[PDB]
């Protein structure tokens, strides 16, 4: 399941 959701963005 169940992403996540920082997995593809950070800051």
Partner 1 sequence: MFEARLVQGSILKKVLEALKDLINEACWDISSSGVNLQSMDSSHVSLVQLTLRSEGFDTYRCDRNLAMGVNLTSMSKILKCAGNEDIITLRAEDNADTLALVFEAPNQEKVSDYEMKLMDLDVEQLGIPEQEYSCVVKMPSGEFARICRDLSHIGDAVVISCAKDGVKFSASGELGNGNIKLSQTSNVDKEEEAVTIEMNEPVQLTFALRYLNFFTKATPLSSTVTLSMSADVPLVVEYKIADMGHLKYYLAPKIED
Which residues form the interface with partner 1 (CB under 8 A)? 2-11
Q: Which residue has the tokens 């996540």?
A: 4
CB of 7 to partner 1, least distance (A): 7
CB of 3 to partner 1, least distance (A): 4
Q: What tokens does 2 get?
A: 């169940």
CB of 10 to partner 1, least distance (A): 6
Q: Count CB neighbours of 11 within 10 A.
A: 3
Q: Which residue has the tokens 């399941």?
A: 1
């Amino acid at each position: 399941r169940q992403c996540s959701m920082t997995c593809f963005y950070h800051s």
